[PDB]
Design an enzyme around this catalytic site. Structure first.
Site, PDB file in Angstrom:
ATOM      1  N   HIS A 181      10.837  32.079 -31.993  1.00 49.00           N
ATOM      2  CA  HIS A 181      10.336  31.720 -33.320  1.00 49.00           C
ATOM      3  C   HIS A 181       8.861  31.340 -33.316  1.00 49.00           C
ATOM      4  CE1 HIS A 181      14.345  32.187 -34.405  1.00 49.00           C
ATOM      5  NE2 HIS A 181      14.699  30.962 -34.756  1.00 49.00           N
TER       6      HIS A 181
ATOM      7  N   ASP B  56      20.307  37.095 -30.021  1.00 45.06           N
ATOM      8  CA  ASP B  56      20.433  35.973 -30.939  1.00 45.06           C
ATOM      9  C   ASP B  56      20.477  36.511 -32.368  1.00 45.06           C
ATOM     10  OD1 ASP B  56      20.353  33.610 -32.344  1.00 45.06           O
ATOM     11  OD2 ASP B  56      18.485  32.876 -31.469  1.00 45.06           O
TER      12      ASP B  56
HETATM   13  N1  LIG Z   1      21.747  24.629 -40.357  1.00 45.85           N
HETATM   14  C1  LIG Z   1      20.333  24.347 -40.587  1.00 45.85           C
HETATM   15  C2  LIG Z   1      19.362  24.992 -39.562  1.00 45.85           C
HETATM   16  C3  LIG Z   1      18.106  25.628 -40.206  1.00 45.85           C
HETATM   17  N2  LIG Z   1      17.037  25.877 -39.194  1.00 45.85           N
HETATM   18  C4  LIG Z   1      17.144  27.191 -38.488  1.00 45.85           C
HETATM   19  C5  LIG Z   1      17.435  27.021 -36.967  1.00 45.85           C
HETATM   20  C6  LIG Z   1      16.827  28.123 -36.067  1.00 45.85           C
HETATM   21  C7  LIG Z   1      17.714  28.502 -34.856  1.00 45.85           C
HETATM   22  C8  LIG Z   1      16.936  28.779 -33.558  1.00 45.85           C
HETATM   23  C9  LIG Z   1      17.606  29.804 -32.606  1.00 45.85           C
HETATM   24  O1  LIG Z   1      18.963  29.590 -32.490  1.00 45.85           O
HETATM   25  O2  LIG Z   1      17.357  31.091 -33.029  1.00 45.85           O
HETATM   26  C10 LIG Z   1      17.001  29.691 -31.103  1.00 45.85           C
HETATM   27  F1  LIG Z   1      17.415  30.727 -30.349  1.00 45.85           F
HETATM   28  F2  LIG Z   1      15.666  29.726 -31.041  1.00 45.85           F
HETATM   29  F3  LIG Z   1      17.378  28.603 -30.432  1.00 45.85           F
HETATM   30  K   LIG Z   2      17.399  38.349 -33.073  1.00 46.43           K
HETATM   31 ZN   LIG Z   3      19.558  31.498 -32.911  1.00 42.75          ZN
END
Ligand SMILES: NCCCNCCCCCC(O)(O)C(F)(F)F
Ligand SMILES: [K+]
Ligand SMILES: [Zn+2]
Ligand SMILES: [K+]
Length: 607
Positions: free
Chosen positions: A136, A173
């Protein structure tokens, strides 16, 4: 190339969210401790070369980040809690810790160490249990749960310190790795594939660039592939249809020199942020289908995954195939859902202007070799050789029952290799075929083997029928041999060693995975075109838990056969076949997508 690296350090588990924030509460240090302890329990981490963690120098951090942003996070270890959550609000959905800047440098340094171990042939592949995540973060912003883009580090690092031109990045992912896409948007050096939960932009990060629309910019157009999931609950057939029909076709023609994956396991059943229905064992096959690329040089890097009670199940399934352990059979495969077929249909069309194979018409010993008695070959220490009074009585029983020669050594070995497998696989040089093929599967169908996959190259009909639903035949010929039975498949210049591959990824692999066989039976005749048999033999090892019996009729071919059965690295092919050859494929894809829905790459037409 020998072992497999596992980079991890408990220190990256010593930073956590220090206030209330429902956006990041799912991101906990316990994700890193349960993943290692799961690898420890199942007897996996002890089998991998533990490379120690190093810090990433600021010379390496500026490869994918700005000085203005690195100095901003360099001041975080001196901030208290009141100052920390203020700095964390300048970014979206991320939190900072007193120790997070120290751990983030260990996060990049861990993957870079994995890149060096894989590229220096110290190991064959590897995995980095690492926190914080990466895909990200952008050139001057922290986003998601990430600080620095771990695998974007690895790409430019491998691009710089090894002069590599083609790097394949896979991001399974289900969050779009927008930092990866931005970094290599105008870059044809790094091919970035990414499937992700989209829900028509309804789901975080709610980006238009996440849709299949975005293919690249400038000279890099064609090397960014987004496969947006528009409905939750995707199953194993959804994930495999993706690999078979967009990722694998362009991967083998990309012919990458190094494959890097963004391992996120929120794509598994039970994860609260992913809400998908893929079982953990699907990741054992995702890695395995990527091993023939880059001669096996694959550096797995952890990203997401939040169900602590099931995150460890898939990190072990990843390492299981990383070490070459037999992949578990996937049962219940079929057609992808309509929305998955809609997404695979769209991006296949948008990418068709580059990867032209998407165009459509308008509307502990694990192998045994029994070679011609007297020969002695150089075997890679995980192979063996040859009957017995228990077995000879069966060969004598079959001798007078249905059928003298030395082929009764062909049969006595063929029985005992199957008795031993039900060792992982084997291979036998055979005299006459028909008796060897007949005695093979007829003894296998009663082993018991519920269903038997049969792959045979050559011409003419083999000696077994496909009437019932316990057998399926694959054959590659010189003549037409237009068939009618659905439990069969007959196929077919210098394009043979290049069109056979996309006929294996787009046709042979999908029907076999739905078939879920108990045993694969490979047969070739003497007649060669050898540059591809090793690539085939490697990818069917994902079925029948690896149990495959090869029957060569032998030339130098045997040396390359056992190469893939033993689990050794597989030679790359180098980077488009004939028009009449792919008209051959879709003439049998439309014919077979009735029974076997995994062949479908478009949404069915309603009647
Ligand atoms: N329920 C509320 C969460 C909202 N915020 C989005 C979270 C992003 C997930 C990150 C990910 O899982 O893609 C990583 F691989 F980087 F760890
Ligand atoms: K992805
Ligand atoms: Zn993720
Ligand atoms: K790209």
């Amino acid at each position: 190339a020998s072992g497999s690296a596992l980079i991890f350090d408990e220190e990256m588990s010593r930073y956590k969210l220090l206030w209330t924030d429902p956006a990041c509460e799912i991101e906990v240090p316990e994700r890193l401790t349960v993943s290692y302890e799961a690898l420890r329990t199942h007897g996996l981490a002890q089998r991998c070369k533990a490379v120690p963690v190093r810090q990433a120098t600021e010379q390496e951090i500026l490869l994918a980040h700005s000085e203005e942003y690195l100095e901003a996070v360099k001041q975080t270890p001196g901030m208290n809690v009141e100052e920390l959550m203020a700095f964390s609000k300048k970014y979206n959905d991320v939190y900072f810790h007193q120790n997070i800047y120290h751990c983030a440098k260990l996060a990049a340094g861990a993957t870079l160490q994995l890149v060096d171990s894989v590229m220096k042939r110290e190991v064959r592949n590897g995995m980095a249990l690492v926190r914080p995540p990466g895909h990200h973060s952008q050139r001057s912003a922290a986003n998601g749960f990430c600080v620095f883009n771990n695998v974007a580090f690895a790409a430019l690092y491998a691009k710089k310190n090894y002069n590599l031109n083609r790097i394949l990045i896979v991001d399974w992912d289900v969050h779009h790795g927008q930092g990866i896409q931005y970094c290599f948007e105008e870059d044809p050096s790094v091919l970035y594939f990414s499937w992700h939960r989209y829900e028509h932009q309804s789901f975080w990060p709610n980006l238009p660039e996440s849709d299949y629309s975005s293919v690249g910019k400038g000279k890099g157009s064609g090397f960014n592939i987004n496969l947006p999931w528009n409905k939750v609950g995707m199953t194993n057939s959804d994930y495999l249809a993706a690999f078979f029909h967009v990722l694998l076709p362009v991967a083998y023609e990309f012919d990458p020199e190094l494959v890097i994956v963004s391992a996120g396991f929120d794509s598994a059943i039970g994860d609260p942020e992913g809400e998908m229905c893929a079982l953990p064992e699907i990741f054992a096959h995702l890695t395995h289908l990527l091993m023939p690329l880059a001669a096996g040089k694959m550096c797995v890097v952890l990203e997401g995954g939040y169900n602590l009670t099931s995150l460890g199940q898939s990190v072990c399934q990843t390492v299981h195939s990383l070490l070459g352990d037999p992949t578990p059979r996937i049962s219940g495969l079929g057609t992808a859902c309509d929305s998955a077929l809609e997404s695979i249909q769209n991006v296949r069309n948008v990418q068709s202007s580059y990867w032209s194979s998407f165009k459509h018409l308008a509307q502990s010993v694990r192998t045994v070799v029994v070679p011609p008695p007297g020969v002695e070959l150089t075997l890679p220490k995980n192979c063996q050789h040859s009957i017995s009074e228990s077995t000879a009585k069966e060969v004598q029983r079959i001798r007078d029952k249905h059928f003298d020669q030395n082929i009764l050594r062909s049969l006595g070995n063929i029985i005992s290799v199957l008795d031993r497998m039900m060792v992982c696989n084997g291979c036998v040089v055979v005299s006459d075929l028909s008796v060897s093929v007949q005695c093979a599967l007829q003894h296998a169908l009663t082993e018991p083997a519920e269903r038997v996959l049969v792959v045979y190259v050559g011409d003419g009909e083999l000696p077994v029928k496909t009437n019932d639903g316990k057998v399926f035949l694959v054959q590659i010929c010189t003549k037409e041999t237009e068939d009618k039975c659905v439990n069969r498949l007959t196929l077919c210049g210098e394009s043979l060693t290049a069109g056979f591959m996309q006929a294996l990824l787009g046709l042979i692999l999908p029907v076999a995975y739905e078939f879920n066989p108990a045993l694969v039976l490979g047969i070739v005749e003497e007649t060669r075109l050898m540059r591809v048999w090793g690539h085939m033999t490697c990818l069917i090892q994902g079925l029948a838990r690896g149990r495959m019996l090869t029957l060569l009729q032998d030339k130098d071919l045997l040396e390359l056969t056992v190469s893939a059965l033993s689990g050794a690295s597989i030679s790359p092919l180098g980077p488009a076949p004939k028009p009449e050859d792919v008209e051959m494929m879709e003439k049998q894809r439309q014919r077979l997508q009735e029974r076997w829905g995994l062949l479908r790459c478009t949404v069915s037409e309603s009647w």
